[PDB]
Design a protein around this ligand. Structure first.
Ligand SMILES: Nc1ncnc2c1ncn2[C@@H]1O[C@H](COP(=O)(O)OP(=O)(O)NP(=O)(O)O)[C@@H](O)[C@H]1O
Ligand SMILES: Nc1ncnc2c1ncn2[C@@H]1O[C@H](COP(=O)(O)OP(=O)(O)NP(=O)(O)O)[C@@H](O)[C@H]1O
Ligand SMILES: O=C(NOCCO)c1ccc2cncn2c1Nc1ccc(I)cc1F
Ligand SMILES: [Cl-]
Ligand SMILES: [Cl-]
Ligand SMILES: [Mg+2]
Ligand SMILES: [Mg+2]
Lengths: 276, 314
């Protein structure tokens, strides 16, 4: 088989965890615990499989303390991604399911490690395209691991050489230009910055955005048209004012007005120092 | 029961309540998988056998990553479905939680959804769509009058039919917590949402009427009508989700093709698709429309047409 490809029958596929926007995750064993994501694209064309293999070559060299380890992929019996298995819960489970009570010094540190991992991704010219608290894990409760980055080639079904991109999964983290799907490529470093802005909202408010709106199609249209944005008044009283300003800059409707992660990381680190 | 039932509708409603009393508490190990009935953007439906009762049910399983307090409230609000009993509403057996999945057990409809029937029929005849409109109108009227429920998801995939000729609504918003939970979790590729609710304006069941007229146009021409068919495509007689929503808001509503449908049917869907939610006809106005009064009088062997379209036996 190919480089970093896991041959058939090597991974002992165990219990089914759940499905997301582009795959179904299973707990597996392969030189330790692994997460195996059976991709929704089961019938890839040689053109798509080659573009997927080229992207695996990129993702497998993204190694960083805040980046979920990419362990390889499978083609038989089906297309699959093999990553490090995270003990514990994702940031989404901590905030919105378990309702873990963090102190502000720990919430700032979660945002700081996330900005650290995102800065590394953009330094390697990699767009995450799917940043959300579901893809941020508090590994063994301390280290932040960002997962489900890149993989643009299998987040859509291919018509030979051209791919139609459709929204999948949750939309709460999608930038207005990602919602519209109208520009040449809606995904960029700045769209990741917006998703990071929504994650900052979750940390500093304890809530998902648009809690008062249960109509999803209203959210898609008004966010895409620029008529709707997260209510920054929901921010808790103990949130540092510099964090609310940074949050507002990441959530700018125009992507040209959002800061980049070198500046974002520098602001979070300064606020972590200028803090009781 | 105390509703406008004919003697056959009341007997079937009684028979359903009878079978429902054989169903005690629903548990995951009391079920046996038969086959899959289909999957949506946020759920999967299976034909199952409730072994303690012998009943065959349609079991929908929704996997939501929510806090248990919200989940327990969702299971609570779904218990209202025990009191939604109408010839135009899909029956209900129970809603419970197990193994991280919300289970909604309902009556199995062997004709599938009108979305499935649409693909097998190509197009649905106008005289058949008259019987569907009466069922959708009376189903929306039952939910709003007897329960103050708004459907919020009227579309062909949520109108179910069976070989007995019954046409029933399903997947309506009995649980507001469930609507918000799935708004955060999934997305679709199309939308039947009215233009005013897309902009955050709430006009009660006027939006459900928009969704019905949109569904009637799709089933009449055999194609989702946003955007409208382009010239030569019509005489044969890939937009993203945001563009579809932007089109519903900023463009004139779709309409039936001229000539091939009766003027009463064309006027009926036009009154259903007026972008102004107040000028849009309401449930009482539609029930006395010329198209409904004509279809209510027509004798249409819907059960015979359905099994013929699907391939079943009478
Ligand atoms: N590396 C991992 N270790 C442990 N659990 C994981 C891992 N990756 C995913 N999961 C879990 O597997 C389930 C499905 O994840 P996934 O398919 O990635 O959906 P999602 O993260 O919620 N949305 P998305 O990642 O954008 O598709 C969730 O309960 C995750 O917490
Ligand atoms: N009571 C039932 N009896 C028989 N088939 C059913 C029943 N309920 C649902 N189905 C079938 O199951 C399919 C999936 O249902 P559902 O989960 O609501 O997705 P959907 O409505 O088709 N599309 P969407 O609502 O956008 O996710 C439907 O299209 C029907 O064909
Ligand atoms: O089913 C739903 N959406 O479709 C899933 C996407 O695939 C659905 C959506 C909203 C909702 C609010 N209260 C119940 N709700 C649903 N369920 C439901 C309702 C009535 C019956 I009768 C049977 C049912 F299953
Ligand atoms: Cl498997
Ligand atoms: Cl009938
Ligand atoms: Mg994930
Ligand atoms: Mg449905």
């Amino acid at each position: 088989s190919d480089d970093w490809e896991i041959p058939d029958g090597q991974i002992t596929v165990g219990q089914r965890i759940g499905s997301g926007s582009f795959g179904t995750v299973y707990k597996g064993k392969w030189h330790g615990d692994v997460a195996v994501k059976m991709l929704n694209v089961t019938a890839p064309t040689p053109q798509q499989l080659q573009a997927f293999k080229n992207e695996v070559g990129v993702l497998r060299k993204t190694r960083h303390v805040n980046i979920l380890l990419f362990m390889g992929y499978s083609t038989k019996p089906q297309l699959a991604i093999v990553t490090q298995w995270c003990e514990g819960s994702s940031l989404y489970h901590h905030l919105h399911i378990i309702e873990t009570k963090f102190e502000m010094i720990k919430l700032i540190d979660i945002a700081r490690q996330t900005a650290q991992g995102m800065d590394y991704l953009h330094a390697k010219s990699i767009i995450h395209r799917d940043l959300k608290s579901n893809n941020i894990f508090l590994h063994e409760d301390l280290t932040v691991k960002i997962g489900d980055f890149g993989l643009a080639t299998v987040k859509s079904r291919w018509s030979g050489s051209h791919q139609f991109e459709q929204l999948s999964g949750s939309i709460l983290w999608m930038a207005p230009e990602v919602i519209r799907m109208q520009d040449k490529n809606p995904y960029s470093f700045q769209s990741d910055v917006y998703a990071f802005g929504i994650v900052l909202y979750e940390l500093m408010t304890g809530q998902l955005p648009y809690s008062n709106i249960n109509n999803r199609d209203q959210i898609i249209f008004m966010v895409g048209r620029g008529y709707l944005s997260p209510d920054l008044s929901k921010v808790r009283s103990n949130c540092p004012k510099a964090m609310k300003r940074l949050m507002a800059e990441c959530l700018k409707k125009k992507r040209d007005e959002r800061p980049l992660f070198p500046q974002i990381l520098a602001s979070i680190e300064l606020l972590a120092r200028s803090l009781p | 029961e105390e509703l406008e039932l004919d003697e056959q509708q009341r007997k079937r409603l009684e028979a359903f309540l009878t079978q429902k009393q054989k169903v005690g508490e629903l548990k995951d190990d009391d079920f046996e998988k038969i086959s899959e009935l289909g999957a949506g953007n946020g759920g999967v439906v299976f034909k199952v056998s409730h072994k303690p009762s012998g009943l065959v049910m349609a079991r929908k399983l929704i996997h939501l990553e929510i806090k248990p307090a919200i989940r327990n409230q969702i299971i609570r609000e779904l218990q209202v479905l025990h009191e939604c009993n109408s010839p135009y509403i899909v029956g209900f057996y129970g809603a419970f939680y197990s193994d991280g999945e919300i289970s909604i057990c309902m009556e199995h409809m062997d004709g599938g959804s009108l979305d499935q029937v649409l693909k097998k029929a190509g197009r649905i005849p106008e005289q058949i769509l008259g019987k569907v409109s009466i069922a959708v109108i009376k189903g929306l009227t039952y939910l709003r009058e007897k329960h103050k429920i708004m459907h919020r998801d009227v579309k062909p995939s949520n109108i179910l039919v069976n070989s007995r000729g019954e046409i029933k609504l399903c997947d309506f918003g009995v649980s507001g917590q469930l609507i918000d939970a799935m708004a955060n979790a999934f997305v679709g590729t199309r939308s039947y949402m009215s233009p005013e609710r897309l902009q955050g304006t709430h006009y009660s069941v006027q939006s459900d009427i928009w969704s019905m007229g949109l569904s009637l146009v799709e089933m009449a021409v055999g194609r989702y009508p946003i955007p409208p068919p382009d010239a030569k495509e019509l005489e044969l007689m890939p937009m993203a989700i945001f563009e579809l929503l932007d089109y519903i808001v900023n463009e004139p509503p779709p309409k039936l093709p001229s000539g091939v449908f009766s003027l009463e049917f064309q006027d009926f869907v036009n009154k259903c698709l007026i972008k102004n939610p107040a000028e849009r006809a309401d449930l009482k106005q539609l029930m006395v429309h010329a198209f409904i009064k004509r279809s209510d009088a027509e004798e249409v062997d819907f059960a015979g047409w359905l099994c013929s379209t699907i391939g079943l036996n009478q």
